[PDB]
Amino acid sequence: GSSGFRKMAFPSGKVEGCMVQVTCGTTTLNGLWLDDTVYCPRHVICTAEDMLNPNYEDLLIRKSNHSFLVQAGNVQLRVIGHSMQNCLLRLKVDTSNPKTPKYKFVRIQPGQTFSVLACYNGSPSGVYQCAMRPNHTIKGSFLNGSCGSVGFNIDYDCVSFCYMHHMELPTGVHAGTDLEGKFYGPFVDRQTAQAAGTDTTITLNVLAWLYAAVINGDRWFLNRFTTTLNDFNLVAMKYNYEPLTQDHVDILGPLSAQTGIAVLDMCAALKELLQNGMNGRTILGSTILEDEFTPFDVVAQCSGVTF
C-alpha cells in the first residue's frame, strides 16, 4: 500500500513570474502576463448567470478599463486597454513584466505533451506534464478550482505557450484554448452540455497505474488468471474503456519487465475490477481506478529497469 501517486515536477523557467490574477465583477481567474499585455479567459466578464447564453460583444461594451483588477502578488497592474481575441481577453497594462522570457504562441495537437502551471487561488503550486487526449481535453485534478492557467514547452531559452485552461467539464476533464483564444476541440465558453465523448476511460493509464501499485506493495488485485487481447477489449468497451492495441502493449513493456507481470495478466486483473468493483478496497490510497497517469509518468517516479 501507499499514500497515493505524485506526478513528476518539471521545469518552469520563470513562467511563474508571468502569472497574475484578473478580477472582473465577482470572478477571479488566472492570466498570462507578457511585456505590457495580459491574457485570460474572456468568461471572466460573466457572472454565474451570464453562462447559459453569453454574448460577449455586449457584455464587454459594458466594461471599461477600471472594470478589471489585475494583480501581480501584492502589486496591481493598471489596465489601460482591453480588447477581445476570440475567447481570450487582451488587456494592456501600464507596465511590462520584467521577468518576461523569449516566447512564441504555437498550437500543438493531441499526443504532444507540455508542462502546465496550476494556480491555487493564485500562487503557483507546481508544474506538471500533460498530454492532449485525442478528444482534445486533459485529465488532471490539479486543474480543479483553477482556470486561466497555461501550458507550455521549453526549447533552450524559448518558452512555447500552447494552452490556456478555461472551463472544467462535468466529466472530470478540462478544456482549453491555444494562446490566440481558439479552443482545442468542439468546446465553447458557455454553460452547456458539450462534454460528449470525454467520459471514455484511458485504459493505458489505469494499467500503468496498476503497475505503479504493484511496484509499491499493492498486490491483492492480482489474481492468477489471464486473458486474450480480444476478450479484454470486449469488456473494455462495455465499461467505456479505451480498447487496447498491441501497440499500447509495447509501451507497457518496461514496467512488465520490472514487476515481472505480463501485460495480459494485468488485464485479467483489471477485467475483474471492472466486473466486480473494488469493494471498499483500495489501491495506492484510492477507492476508484485512476487514469490520470500515463505509463511514462509512472516509470518516471517509479524508475526501475534502466533504458
As given in the structure block, the three cell numbers for residue 299 are 516509470
CATH of residue 278's domain is: 1.10.1840.10
Catalytic residue among 43, 82, 165, 166: 43
Q: What distances in angstroms separate CA 263 from CA 211, 235, 270, 289, one per listed residue?
A: 9, 16, 10, 17
Coil, helix or strand at residue 10:
coil
> Which among 253, 267, 229 is positioned nearest to 307, based on CA atoms?
253
Helix (H) or strand (E) holding 269: helix 263-275
Coil, helix or strand at residue 211:
helix
Whether 1 maps to a domain, the answer reads: no
Whether 2 maps to a domain, the answer reads: no
Q: What distances in angstroms separate CA 81 from CA 14, 68, 206, 208, one per listed residue?
A: 25, 10, 47, 48
CA dihedral 114, 119, 123, 124 (to 10 degrees): -20
The answer to whether residues 125 and 76 belong to one domain is: no
Per-residue buried b or exposed e for 87-117, using 16+ beta carbons within 10 Å of the residue's own CB: bbbebbbeeebeebeebeeeebeeeebbbbb
The answer to whether residues 145 and 44 belong to one domain is: no
Whether 6 maps to a domain, the answer reads: no
Contacts of 196 (CB under 8 A, 6+ apart): none
> Looking only at Cα atoms, what is the longest distance across the chain?
67
What DSSP character marks residue 65? S
Whether 140 maps to a domain, the answer reads: yes
Whether 124 maps to a domain, the answer reads: yes
Way it was determined = X-ray
Coil, helix or strand at residue 81:
strand
The answer to whether residues 40 and 55 belong to one domain is: yes
Helix (H) or strand (E) holding 257: helix 253-259
Residue 5: burial class (beta carbons within 10 Å; 0-12, 13-18, 19+): buried
Whether residue 103 contacts residue 86, with contact meaning beta carbons closer than 8 Å, is answered with no
Contacts of 158 (CB under 8 A, 6+ apart): 101, 102, 103, 104
Whether 75 maps to a domain, the answer reads: yes
The answer to whether residues 165 and 234 belong to one domain is: no
Helix (H) or strand (E) holding 209: helix 203-215
Which residues partner with 27 through β-bridges?
24
The number of folded domains in the chain is 3
- Listed resolution, Å: 2.9
Distance CA 173, CA 207 (A): 19
Is 43 annotated as catalytic?
A: yes
Whether residue 104 contacts residue 53, with contact meaning beta carbons closer than 8 Å, is answered with no
Distance CA 89, CA 8 (A): 32
Is 174 annotated as catalytic?
A: no
Range of the domain at 142: 12-16+101-184
Which residue, 44, 74, 94, sits at the end of a domain?
94
Whether 253 maps to a domain, the answer reads: yes
Catalytic residue among 18, 119, 147, 302: 147
Distance CA 59, CA 22 (A): 16
